[PDB]
Amino acid sequence: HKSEVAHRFKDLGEENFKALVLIAFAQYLQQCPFEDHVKLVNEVTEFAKTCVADESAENCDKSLHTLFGDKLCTVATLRETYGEMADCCAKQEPERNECFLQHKDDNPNLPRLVRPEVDVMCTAFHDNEETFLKKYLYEIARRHPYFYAPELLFFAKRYKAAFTECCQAADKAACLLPKLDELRDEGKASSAKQRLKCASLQKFGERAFKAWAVARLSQRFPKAEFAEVSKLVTDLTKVHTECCHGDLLECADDRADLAKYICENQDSISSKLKECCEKPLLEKSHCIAEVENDEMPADLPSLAADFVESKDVCKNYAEAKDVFLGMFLYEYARRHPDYSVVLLLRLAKTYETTLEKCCAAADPHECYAKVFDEFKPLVEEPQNLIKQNCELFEQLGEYKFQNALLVRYTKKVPQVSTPTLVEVSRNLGKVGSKCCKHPEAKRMPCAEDYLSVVLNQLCVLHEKTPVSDRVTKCCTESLVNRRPCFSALEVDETYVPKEFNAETFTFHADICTLSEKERQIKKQTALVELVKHKPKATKEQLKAVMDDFAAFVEKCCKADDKETCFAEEGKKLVAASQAALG
């Protein structure tokens, strides 16, 4: 368009425009005060208004990248604060923008953002809604400079909704704290998903991502023909490559182009997209990404005729191997939305291995006649794992299920630090509580998503400080066999048991007035240390000791003299447990 800033303003509107400008400048100028960013936002919005009133007004015909870079380069403290980032201003576009993009800081060193009390948060929201929400948007944007800005805005809208609902409630905290925890978990998971997809693309190549996209899109749009699914795969791979490069405008343009193509070809893709396709360009691609799978066509035949029984199986495969394998993955995935994507990828890899082996064999047709038999144990392994773990969850409840997982995973990898073990086992228990309440048809996708986020968290922590070769192997594996690698871990037979430390099992009266969450964390930390000290202890011995611990805590937390109760009863409990275990 003649004026890109005016067109963007008119499509997005003033509120969204200002929010996104604030996000972008905070993602680049991560160290500048909130008031300075607000001043910059007001200036940019004012210029955009001049452009909207008259497309021929001065500087309105310049590109968005040129305008953004110039505004960045007018910041007076650029050298003093950012150093070599100021040197980007001596380059011409697009070198200047590429330099600015390269000089973003993934891990800025700012203090952690502390959650204020519910009442002060609600009071600040009530006094000035706009400044409260904008300041927190600035704080989050300056800490996650690669996070997709429109998704940040979509999170911010729900934050406003949560505050609006819960700050007029009878019990403000009990309303708002679950919503804040939900949103924080959700945002951290989304950022991890972005980084994870980009790193997997870089490490394992475009072809693996295209296989993943074939599976996911065939699940999403089972009535679509394979040619349309392949078109969507190519375009989505392009979009994700460019978004992994990190240029916000180029990434947003690619996403918008894909969204409007999908909206104009709804008749060939899905029957569930009308509402998303009536939505603004800002929300369209996100809406499309979040919509549930379409209904699969009825009475789909088995893959046997085309992929096992055909006499031309090897000819069709060797003609164009990846198209044939994509067709196999398409037909398999469209029939099985109940599968994780990685399970379907395992099936595709198995079929590819069998075809490579058999089409060079003396009798290929006889060779691959039973390839579908190989799919049965691969399919049933995660189904059986889900069955077992959800049975144990319904028997135990979330906390005692977390304790079971705690014992199991400490026995498997005792070298891992206790905080990591506790945090990851708690999150795995949360995965259990989340996914075990779905019907089976949806249980495996849920597990895949939430396990992927939890396992990624673990892998990132363990890479910051490596301690176990098996964890490193699982964490560097292909994401298709990352979870199977983790499920295949066994009890560490070579572990030398940790020696007794009296302080570790010394307890005080503060435990009685800790929050329930913190008290649970302390009890679980002590349980991990106990399993590290006595790894051979049977479940009956451990359960007897835990019952003794619960009795001791209940008695001394209601004792008139808590301190000496804890000391004396703790010496008694420690000696009694030590005599029971062995």
Ligand SMILES: *[Se]c1ccccc1C(=O)Nc1ccccc1
């Ligand atoms: Se940028 C920055 C970083 C740390 C402390 C202060 C600043 C700042 O004031 N930047 C600024 C000055 C003038 C106009 C806009 C922004």
Ligand SMILES: CCCCCCCCCCCCCC(=O)O
């Ligand atoms: C739930 C997050 C815990 C850490 C941050 C504590 C304060 C949360 C307030 C969030 C206000 C909205 C932020 C936004 O606009 O994105």
Ligand SMILES: CCCCCCCCCCCCCC(=O)O
């Ligand atoms: C990579 C996550 C580091 C921890 C981030 C602390 C602040 C999170 C605020 C919660 C809501 C926004 C989450 C997000 O921006 O991704």
Ligand SMILES: CCCCCCCCCCCCCC(=O)O
């Ligand atoms: C001569 C080619 C025969 C190949 C076997 C399929 C014949 C029917 C084609 C239409 C159904 C499958 C199309 C598709 O792969 O999406």
Ligand SMILES: CCCCCCCCCCCCCC(=O)O
């Ligand atoms: C200097 C002016 C900068 C303002 C331009 C910001 C444009 C952001 C567009 C985001 C649109 C996202 C569309 C999508 O993801 O599908």
Ligand SMILES: CCCCCCCCCCCCCC(=O)O
């Ligand atoms: C959020 C990743 C997709 C970015 C582009 C949005 C366009 C959606 C096309 C359909 C792809 C669905 C991906 C998904 O499973 O979320």
Ligand SMILES: CCCCCCCCCCCCCC(=O)O
């Ligand atoms: C139409 C595009 C086809 C893309 C290639 C599909 C091949 C399926 C077999 C490979 C499956 C494993 C993928 C992976 O390495 O993670």
Ligand SMILES: CCCCCCCCCCCCCC(=O)O
């Ligand atoms: C033999 C190592 C294969 C790695 C892939 C593991 C796939 C997980 C499903 C497990 C089903 C049993 C077959 C198998 O172990 O592969």
Ligand SMILES: CCCCCCCCCCCCCC(=O)O
């Ligand atoms: C501790 C988690 C409780 C939920 C049960 C998970 C059982 C293993 C997950 C199976 C599905 C994962 C996705 C996949 O690997 O295909």
Ligand SMILES: CCCCCCCCCCCCCC(=O)O
């Ligand atoms: C803290 C290290 C634990 C790493 C191993 C956790 C296993 C996660 C795999 C999925 C969980 C259910 C499947 C299983 O129990 O085998």
Ligand SMILES: CCCCCCCCCCCCCC(=O)O
């Ligand atoms: C339902 C609440 C039950 C809480 C159980 C927590 C288990 C913690 C184990 C602590 C073991 C103490 C024995 C010892 O120090 O030797």
